[PDB]
């Protein structure tokens, strides 16, 4: 009932995101836990409704990948007055993640997640 | 053929142990071995002292891996190469599922800082890199 999920941070649909998702799904599957797929937006006046729609499509796509890979997945759109890396890091701590999976190209978001996470961070090319 | 977990270690510490423990669990879960690697420049830069210390760390590290219910292998790399490149090339050579590495390193004042070898490994690796604090 109480598991430690794999947290995967997704920005957009891409081949890199798929690779990140498939690695995450294999971890989750091996450990018997779900994957939590996260996308962060600033909210407040900074977030349009158009932004929420695209994020939701990306997340819906991401979770379909996880599931197709034989893992349980859940979508979490974070709209919290935060920037992505703090959101990802705070989220991972809030759900007691086993690890955070992110794509790298570092990239600004990735470097702050690497440096600030209190969890293992798994970097996928 | 298996794809091993590769884990890089420098010195014996409670931190290196956290890295080994995570690497060992990855390996357990996947039914693969852990390859413990340590890199040394060789030639004029490496003293016998460094070899002996390297070998003692590797042995200690394999033991931690084994204690955690995984198989370990010691791989001391002495190739005239800089450590990030050694680690990255080795992981490609062995077709690792992932590299596990400690991203913090002690500065000369005793304070842990973001390691530059670890940083370079994360940036250069072709394999997934699992970053442990
Ligand atoms: N806004 C937002 N929400 C969720 N996940 C994100 C966001 N921006 C980037 N990312 C993820 C996408 C990659 O997996 C990783 C690298 O971002 P990089 O910018 O290349 O460092 O961070």
Numbering used by the authors:
A (entry chain A): 1 to 105, 115 to 134
B (entry chain B): 2 to 134
Quote the study's own text.
Universal stress proteins (USP) are widely spread proteins in nature. In stress conditions such as heat shock, nutrient starvation, the presence of oxidants, uncouplers, DNA-damaging agents, or other stress agents which may arrest cell growth, USP constitute a natural biological defense mechanism.
Based on this observation, we hypothesized that soaking or cocrystallization of that protein with ATP could result in formation of a crystal with the ligand bound in this region. As a result, we obtained the structure of AF0826 with dAMP bound in the vicinity of the ATP-binding motif. All of the residues binding dAMP in AF0826 are analogs of the residues binding AMP in the NE1028 structure, and interact with the ligand in very similar ways, as shown in Fig. 4B and D. Where hydroxyl groups are interacting with G and A (AF0826: G103, A9; NE1028: G114, A10) and adenine ring is positioned by either V or S (S40 and V40, respectively). AF0826 displays the same type 1 dimerization, the dimerization interface is formed by β5 and α4 from each monomer as it takes place is case of NE1028.
